[PDB]
Amino acid sequence: ASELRSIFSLKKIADAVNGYEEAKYVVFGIPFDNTSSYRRGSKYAPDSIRGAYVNLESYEYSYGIDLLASGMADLGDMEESEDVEYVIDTVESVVSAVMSDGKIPIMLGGEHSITVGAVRALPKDVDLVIVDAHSDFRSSYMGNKYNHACVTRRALDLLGEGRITSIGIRSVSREEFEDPDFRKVSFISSFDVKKNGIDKYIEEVDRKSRRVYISVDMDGIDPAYAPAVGTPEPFGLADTDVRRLIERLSYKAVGFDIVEFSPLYDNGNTSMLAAKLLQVFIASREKYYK
Amino acid sequence: ASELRSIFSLKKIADAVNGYEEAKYVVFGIPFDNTSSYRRGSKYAPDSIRGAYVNLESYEYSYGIDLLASGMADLGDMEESEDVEYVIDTVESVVSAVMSDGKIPIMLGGEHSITVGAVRALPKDVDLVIVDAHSDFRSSYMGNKYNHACVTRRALDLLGEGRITSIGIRSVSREEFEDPDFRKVSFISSFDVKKNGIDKYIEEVDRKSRRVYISVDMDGIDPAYAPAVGTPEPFGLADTDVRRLIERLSYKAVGFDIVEFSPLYDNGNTSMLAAKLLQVFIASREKYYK
Amino acid sequence: ASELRSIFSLKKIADAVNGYEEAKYVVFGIPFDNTSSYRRGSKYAPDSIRGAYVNLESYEYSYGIDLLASGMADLGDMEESEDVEYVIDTVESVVSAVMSDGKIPIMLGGEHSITVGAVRALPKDVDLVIVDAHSDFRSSYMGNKYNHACVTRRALDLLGEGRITSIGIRSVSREEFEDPDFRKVSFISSFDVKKNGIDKYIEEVDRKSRRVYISVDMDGIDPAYAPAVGTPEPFGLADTDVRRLIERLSYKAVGFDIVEFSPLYDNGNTSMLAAKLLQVFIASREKYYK
Amino acid sequence: ASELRSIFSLKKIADAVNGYEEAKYVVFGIPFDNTSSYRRGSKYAPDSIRGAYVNLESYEYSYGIDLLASGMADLGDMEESEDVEYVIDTVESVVSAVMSDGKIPIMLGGEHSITVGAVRALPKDVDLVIVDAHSDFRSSYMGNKYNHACVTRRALDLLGEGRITSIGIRSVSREEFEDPDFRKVSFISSFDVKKNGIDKYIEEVDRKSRRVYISVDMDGIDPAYAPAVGTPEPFGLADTDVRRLIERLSYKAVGFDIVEFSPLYDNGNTSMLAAKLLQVFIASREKYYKEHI
Amino acid sequence: ASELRSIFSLKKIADAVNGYEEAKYVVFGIPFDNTSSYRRGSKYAPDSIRGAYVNLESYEYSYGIDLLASGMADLGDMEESEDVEYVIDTVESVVSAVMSDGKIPIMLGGEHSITVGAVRALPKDVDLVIVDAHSDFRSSYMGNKYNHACVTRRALDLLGEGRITSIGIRSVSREEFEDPDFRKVSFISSFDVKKNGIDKYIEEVDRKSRRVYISVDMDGIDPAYAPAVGTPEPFGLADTDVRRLIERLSYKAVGFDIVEFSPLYDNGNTSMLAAKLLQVFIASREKYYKEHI
Amino acid sequence: ASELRSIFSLKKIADAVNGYEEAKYVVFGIPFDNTSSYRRGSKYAPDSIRGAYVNLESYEYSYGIDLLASGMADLGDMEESEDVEYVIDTVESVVSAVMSDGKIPIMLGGEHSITVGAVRALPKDVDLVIVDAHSDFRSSYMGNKYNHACVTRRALDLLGEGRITSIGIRSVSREEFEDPDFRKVSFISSFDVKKNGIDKYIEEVDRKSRRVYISVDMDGIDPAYAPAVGTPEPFGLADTDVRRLIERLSYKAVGFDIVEFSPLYDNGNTSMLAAKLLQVFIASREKYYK
Ligand SMILES: [Mn+2]
Ligand SMILES: [Mn+2]
Ligand SMILES: [Mn+2]
Ligand SMILES: [Mn+2]
Ligand SMILES: [Mn+2]
Ligand SMILES: [Mn+2]
Ligand SMILES: [Mn+2]
Ligand SMILES: [Mn+2]
Ligand SMILES: [Mn+2]
Ligand SMILES: [Mn+2]
Ligand SMILES: [Mn+2]
Ligand SMILES: [Mn+2]
């Protein structure tokens, strides 16, 4: 009976051996999809990342870290729901608790809008850093203020100006651009990165900010390195630009998330890049602290 | 921390609420693939069946049973291995234990050859009932006696004549047919079923056998109702023939298994039929005992 | 400029050569999708049906009817929305308007929930005829009484006992089976049909009803024939069982809708089946009024 | 040097072991497609059939015939060409030739219009038996008489009345149905079959004809069994219906072909049925000659 | 009755709001394919482009141009035809016509051979700028002069020397390379670009030509960015390289087209780049006329 | 009968018009696959490369070389086997025989493990050059020392220090990093290449080595360019980095293999890249010996 628990186990991130009590890093999943209009399937993103992860080594070669000894847990997934507001509420209290207990939340989702709940838990020293191809700055979309095209908006409301940066941007609504409050966020385009490099904007954030929260909207990355994103936008960042950003900023991170790609639209390469960025986050941080 | 175990959970069959201790039905998964030459992916079958299952109702309408109150557990999956012999050994001891403890093993696999381990645990009153498009009767295949094209062979060696029946058969090797021992198994073709019906051969088994073990090689079923099978064979059984067989024989079953289909070769309809047959098995049996 | 309109045209059903005024059958799409919790994509089915239509002939062989002279019209799609109530309200209006004008509404939708709007606009002497794998009889699903899992409950409230029949049903939640009002609807299982034939249940309707509305939730059909449906359920009707029903009730029908299949889950076959069901409705009816 | 030819071989039908001269059954591909409108990819069918064959046993259980010892050869594929007339003319020579030598041509194709070729080669006693969802009976299509929707018409031009049957049909253009010549061919609807059984229509042909040529347009079968046909038509024949047709008629068959499916549109199940249907033709024919000769 | 036309509409480019008469930019599809050998499905490109466009914003951030107020119209698609000459002749009339009215034709196609049409309509001052992985510069292919591998050749026949440039090329048949006439066209290799930057070659064209027509053969782009092109060729141009080409040249452009990709071969990313490239042409051109007129 | 052989032919590389005797480059396939534990399908890559080849021209533009007159040969495939050792033994023989005859072996395989056989047949003055994402330096994997995760360990045993260089490496298990013998191989990261360029590492080989063998494990290339590889790893080489290496070492090379990509995981692009790498090897070399 226990000899059976010893032989069989449910699906998990391979290196998340530690339970919650002992974990420095707490990986969890939020299967929410219900405001996405173009491609659907983000619901299934966490699970497919658990799938991809087996192909990965328990040791990170670039950083010289063994993830097996990094203290990761995987709680799994929350109930599927159709209600953005309930989903946001739950994220909020979950992120509170992890952070409160001296741990670092790593949230795997479907949609971007779950990040709103995370922002709600941010203290005043923490600044927000987004990777994204769109400014999610609409006042509302589809009669919902929590449509995943409003996340940058919701974040402004909660944090104020001189607090939020988003990088990769190359899709913006007119309604958004003409808004006065638009200038209250630092929007950095993919074209800017392609011209001046990534380190320049990584510098600005590393100077200005005591602590950070990193949210990765997968579609900021060019479709070539990430085909399965929910809303593809040509001319985007390189997977290495996002690696570099994470690499540099992870020592100051209170929390992390990866959102907005759909396992049903490719054969696994995107969920692979996702699982790998989850590695870069934990490995770069452990090297730093040693 | 416990409020978290209350919100998050790892992937499972939805109705497998009960732990091992309280379960009448013990679902587990065996991710083995390593002798399959044509299509690969059975490794991933159990997981995809967990996936499909959510679309299903917790109540069975045809049998009037609520699976939530049927006492199912899901232990999960065993370690992936390349070694048929190790995999077979482990299956053997697992099946022993469940049966020994008054419970009914329900094994989700990749390859058929894992059934060999199950047979090894069968008492003398139990007879074997297979659904399959091939006689897996080769003496050996690819320098392995445990190649999944030898399962009917291995089963003969263990059980003797007048013990094994396989239904759906429409692919047979010459080497197999010319073997003297071939007649020691009751091979029933799909063509026979299409002519005389299924109930006829279900009758023969229900008369002759005190108890049974049911093993479903998914490819016995016609490709139309099951596209993702590992080795497709046209002109095969109807999904309802297999339903009917299970429906009728489940009250005498000591154990069950579903094998030989690959989630990567279709969009989920096959793993759906699989998950549904898992239902028909438990529901038809609970109705009988009431 | 007018010689251009004669050289280019927008995507249409190739036999819908008549404008509204001069039409007997009015074809329109509803790209609504937003309560489907398994497979998503319904939204795109109208477009795809138009696409499949090109492979069909103008002359339906089995009825000596030429569809190019059947008075068909194609109005395209209604703007996408996330609001169920609002979508239903609009449907109610379009449907009422069209029947008032002595025309017949062929509604190509996404979800089944749009059928509610059609039900609202129905005269005391029209009964509802549904093909479906599920009873769709929930009082409410996922915080909503217009969830597509409720379309039959909603039909009941509008129409009362002895007006609604649903064929193909094999998936029922227990809450629905136990609700007292369940029996006020003639629920016919696919098992009943495979056993007693389809004509038996057709006779039961042709007798008891002066006029009808036909709703095809495409999953009533076995996944062998409609693999692209939103919620597959094995052991279903044959495509020829549905053809037969349409063939037989087409002369009494006031309207007709087709729902619940995501064209993304296959390579065209399902939407071809949907396009052929369309061509059947219009040819069997006209053949009649010859 | 020659040890290498012993280790490596080009791709073919695994049982096609003999050279042409020693072969009874000569399997060959014609990758032609350039008249097909709706789904394209027929060109690759013969290759995909060779690939699926590996999954099949060399011995056919239901006939008790070992295909390895049934005198099969595989010539491979013909060059691709955009010209219909050029292919049809090429087929005709290849069909005539193989029949002269008392061999049995099995033509794996793309489109159905390659069949026209084979029909030019037929003696007066041979009748044509077609499995198809449409009456490819159209005077012309897209400024082409040899367009793959006109195959039946071009067949009637060659054979005349009472020589041609086509089974499974369920899609007909009024221009064909209104032709006086339409009744000069036997058309059996997939609905006929589903109502009267296939055997009835098999019985008629067997009694009437002394020899046949069998042409299988893969879309005559219901899309559930052949999902990857070039022009799908629901409410078709059962995969078993076509098997029974072949089982019962292969002993009189002078030639055979399989056409109009496209491997790009599924994961292999359609080319697997196509390969099985080819086993069935050879095997059931060998069963006849082992029993009655 | 008329309330219904207010609720329902046929599918088109979401921003193509104006009728022809009031339009500056006239977008139209030509679903023609019947010369394409390797991957097929170009026919469906224009439809798939309209479908991806829904994912794009009506306002283009990098140019500060609202497309809804840029005078776009969408005529829809032309009948399908199997005849190359017939389509090319049809295009030529449609291109001439739209240019006469001082409008700007945006031709969404399948194959590249539709471009020939548009080239017949060009005035003497207009030069042709082609993005392509091959030199579709072949005297004939498969007994066809208007075969889609001969587009460049037929272009030279019409314009003569110094009038034509083609960028990104990395696949050439020796029969072309050995032609004396090969040097009468400017061919810039994708390797040239990757070495010297795209701007260099953009500078040359801008200085030389007073006006241009831009033809984008989608396979000139590296398969990483356009996976679903009809004839993929690795080591291609960056998606950004083509954007820069358009950005910089759309103010002189009398016409534009996008061709030779097939939506059947991916999940939408290629038609999404195709739709973005069309936004880029219109937007960057409007930016010029808002700044300098 | 002989006029038939002139009209039909079996699947071949369209420029391999010469028989063995008259050939300088000998192209052969090894459909071996049976130690790959993630994606399976390598086995089919030779066939697919032949298929992609049809889209290529006979004349390679960038080298003024006509491949129809380069003395190429295509021998087809070796019978499938499940035995690694045996496959390797056969490879060893074919490779030795071919180099002895002063011919160059282009081996199109499935797995990387076949390269071992080629390594066995190498003279004291030929160094090994590998493109790969992983170090492949395990002493043994999954109960086997000829697992494809070991191909570099096995290379070392045969060749000793200062003879083996591997470029693109970004995935290393810790056991390999810690083994003392690790440093006896020149391991070049894809990060090193993106930073310092590729030419730097090419110079390092062109100098230190008289002659070489080139092995392309296709996953060394970033999933953007070879999405169909057996084990994807993000942050990799550009396809042009590999082209460059081949361009530069082709004149010293004694053999050349291409491995580790399953054609099932894409729609042709990877095998096109593999076919183009083939055409590069043969054109860059010949251009040279002009
Ligand atoms: Mn976002
Ligand atoms: Mn975004
Ligand atoms: Mn089996
Ligand atoms: Mn089997
Ligand atoms: Mn339903
Ligand atoms: Mn329903
Ligand atoms: Mn035909
Ligand atoms: Mn046909
Ligand atoms: Mn071109
Ligand atoms: Mn091109
Ligand atoms: Mn590797
Ligand atoms: Mn390797």
E with D: 3 or more CB pairs under 8 Å?
Answer: yes
SS3 E255: strand
Residue A67 Cα to chain centre, angstroms: 19
Query: What beta strand segments (E) does B69-163 contain?
Result: 72-77, 104-109, 126-131
C-alpha span between A94 and F263 (Å, rounded):
43
Which residue of F lies nearest to A61 if distances are taken between CA atoms?
Answer: F172
Q: Nearest CA to CA, how far is B223 from chain C (Å)?
A: 9
Which residue's structure tokens are 């049995």? D104
Which residues does A134 contact at the CB level (< 8 Å), separation at least 6?
Answer: A149, A169, A171, A172, A217, A219, A231, A233
Name beta bridge partners: A30. A109
Phi, psi of A255 (to 5 degrees): 180, 160
Q: Which 8-state DSSP code applies to residue A113?
A: G
Is residue F223 within 8 A of residue F232, CB to CB? The reply is yes
Q: What residues of chain F lie within 8 A of the CB of E182, using their CB?
A: none
- Kindly provide the b/e burial profile for residues E28-48, where b requires at least 16 CB atoms within 10 angstroms of the residue's own CB: bbbbbbbbbbebbbbbbbbbb
Q: Are F138 and F110 in contact (CB under 8 A)?
A: no
**Could you give the 3-state DSSP secondary structure of residue E74?**
strand
Structure tokens at C45: 């089915």
Residues E177, D188: Cα–Cα separation, whole Å: 57
Contact E29, E252 (CB under 8 A): no
Residues 6+ apart with CB under 8 A from D85: D146
CA C106 to chain centre: 8
CA distance D190 to D204: 16
Contact C244, C24 (CB under 8 A): no
**Inter-chain residue contact A142 with C82, CB threshold 8 Å:** yes
Q: Using an 8 Å CB-CB cutoff, list residues of chain C that contact chain E.
A: 1, 4-5, 7-12, 20-21, 28-29, 47, 51, 74-79, 90, 94, 97, 101
Query: How many CB atoms lie under 10 A from the CB of residue F200?
Result: 12
What are the backbone dihedrals phi and psi of residue D30, each rounded to the nearest 5 degrees, phi first? -130, 100
How many Å lie between the centroid of ligand 1 and the Cα of residue A136?
5
Residue with tokens 């109502």: D195
Q: Is D101 helix (H, G, I), strand (E, B) or coil?
A: coil
Q: Which class for B229: exposed (0-12), middle (13-18), buried (19 or more C-beta within 10 A)?
A: buried
For D58, other C-beta atoms within 10 Å of its C-beta total 18
Q: Dmax over Cα atoms in chain C, in whole Å?
A: 64
Helices assigned H by DSSP within chain F: 2-5, 45-53, 84-100, 115-120, 151-159, 174-178, 190-196, 199-208, 239-249, 269-288
Torsion sign (Cα): A151, A152, A155, A156: negative
Tell which phi-psi region holds residue B77, choosing left (phi > 0), alpha (psi between -120 and 50) or beta. beta
Residues on chain E touching C94 (C-beta within 8 angstroms): 4, 7
Mapping DSSP onto H, E and C, the string for A10-55 reads: CCCCCCCCCCHHHCCEEEEEECCCCCCCCCCCHHHHHHHHHHHHCC
Going from N- to C-terminal start, the domains of chain C cover: 1-290
- DSSP per-residue codes, C72-121: EEEEEEE---S-HHHHHHHHHHHHHHHHHTT-EEEEEESSGGGHHHHHHT
Name beta bridge partners: A59. Answer: A66
Closest CB to F82 among B40, B41, B142 = B142
CATH number of E1-293: 3.40.800.10
DSSP state of F163: S
Phi-psi region of E165 (alpha: psi -120 to 50; beta: other; left: phi over 0): beta
Q: Is A239 annotated as a binding residue?
A: no
With tokens 């082209």, the residue in question is F243
* Contact between D255 and D118 (Cβ < 8 Å): yes
Structure tokens at E145: 């002069």
- Does the distance separating the beta carbons of F59 and E174 come in below 8 Å? yes
C-alpha span between E87 and E109 (Å, rounded): 11
Centre a 10 Å sphere on the Cβ of residue F151 and count the other Cβ atoms it contains.
30
Distance of residue E2 Cα from the nearest chain F Cα, in angstroms = 46
Pick the CATH number of C1-290 from 3.40.50.10490, 3.30.70.380, 3.40.800.10, 3.40.50.720: 3.40.800.10
Residue E164 contacts residue E128 (beta carbons within 8 Å): yes
The total of other beta-carbon atoms located within 10 Å of residue F206's CB is 14
Inter-chain contact A144–C82, Cβ cutoff 8 Å?
yes
The dihedrals phi and psi of C23, each to the nearest 5 degrees, come to -115, 150
CA angle B17, B260, B62 (to 5 degrees): 50
Residue A287 vs residues A63, A64, A78, A208, F195: alpha-carbon distances, Å: 6, 7, 31, 23, 21
Which residues are within 5 Å of ligand 8 (an ion), measured at CB? D 132, 134, 217, 219
Contact D3 F29 (CB under 8 A): no
Token pair recorded at residue A278? 């989850």
Helix segments in chain A, DSSP class H: 2-5, 45-53, 84-100, 115-119, 151-159, 174-177, 190-196, 199-208, 239-249, 269-288
Which chains does chain E touch, 3 or more C-beta pairs < 8 A?
A, C, D, F
CB A52 within 8 A of CB A271: yes
Sheet containing A186-189: order of strands: A72-77, A25-30, A104-109, A253-259, A211-217, A126-131, A164-169, A186-189
For residues C244 and C237, what is the distance between their CA atoms, to the nearest angstrom? 11
- Shortest CA distance from E82: residue in chain D: D142
Tokens 């958004």, located at residue: A176
CA of B116 to the centre of ligand 4 (A): 14
Of F194, F224, F265, Cβ closest to residue A267: F265
- Best mutation target among C40, C81, C113, C148 (most A Cβ atoms within 10 Å) is C40
What is the least distance, in Å, from the CA of B235 to any CA of chain D?
6
User: How crowded is the C-beta side of C188, counted as CA atoms within 13 Å?
Assistant: 24
Chains that touch C (3 or more CB pairs under 8 A): A, B, D, E
Residues 6+ apart with CB under 8 A from E5: C20, C75
What separation in Å is there between the alpha carbon of F252 and the centre of ligand 12?
A: 22
The first and second tokens of residue B279, run together, are 């239902």
> Six-digit token pair at C33?
């999708």
Calculate ∠ Cα F220-F225-F228, nearest 5°.
80
Chain D residues near residue B268 by CB distance under 8 angstroms: none
How many Cβ atoms from other residues are within 10 Å of residue D290's Cβ? Answer: 11
> CA dihedral defined by C275, C277, C282, C284, rounded to 10 degrees?
150
CA of A262 to the centre of ligand 11 (A): 26
User: Cα(first)–Cα(last) distance of chain F, in Å?
Assistant: 41
User: F touches which chains (3+ CB pairs under 8 A)?
Assistant: A, B, D, E
Contacts of F276 in chain E (CB under 8 A): 233-235
C159: phi then psi, degrees, rounded to nearest 5: -125, -20
Q: Is B225 helix (H, G, I), strand (E, B) or coil?
A: coil
CA separation for the pair A23, A9 (Å, rounded): 19
Q: Under a CB-based contact definition with an 8 Å cutoff, are residues B216 and B131 in contact?
A: yes
Q: What is the distance between the alpha carbons of residues E207 and E189, in angstroms, rounded to a whole number?
A: 20
Of the bound ligands, which one is closest to the alpha carbon of residue B115?
Answer: 3
Do residues B49 and B275 touch, judged by C-beta distance below 8 A? yes
The DSSP call for residue D263 is G
Q: Cα of F88 to ligand 5 centre, how many Å?
A: 55
Cα separations in angstroms, A256 against A281, B4, E186, F64: 8, 18, 51, 53
Cross-chain residue pair A97–B20, CB shorter than 8 Å = no
CA nearest neighbour of A207 among A162, A260, A153: A162
Nearest CA among C281, C272, C251 for reference residue C55: C272
Evaluate whether A95 touches A118 at the Cβ level (below 8 Å): yes
Q: How far is the CA of B216 from the centre of ligand 10 (A)?
A: 51
For residue D237, what are its two tokens? 């024949």
DSSP string, B136-164: ---S-BTTBTTSTTSHHHHHHHHH-SSSE
* Distinct helix (H) and strand (E) counts, chain C: 10, 11
Q: Inspect the interface and report whether the beta carbons of D37 and E144 lie closer than 8 Å.
A: no
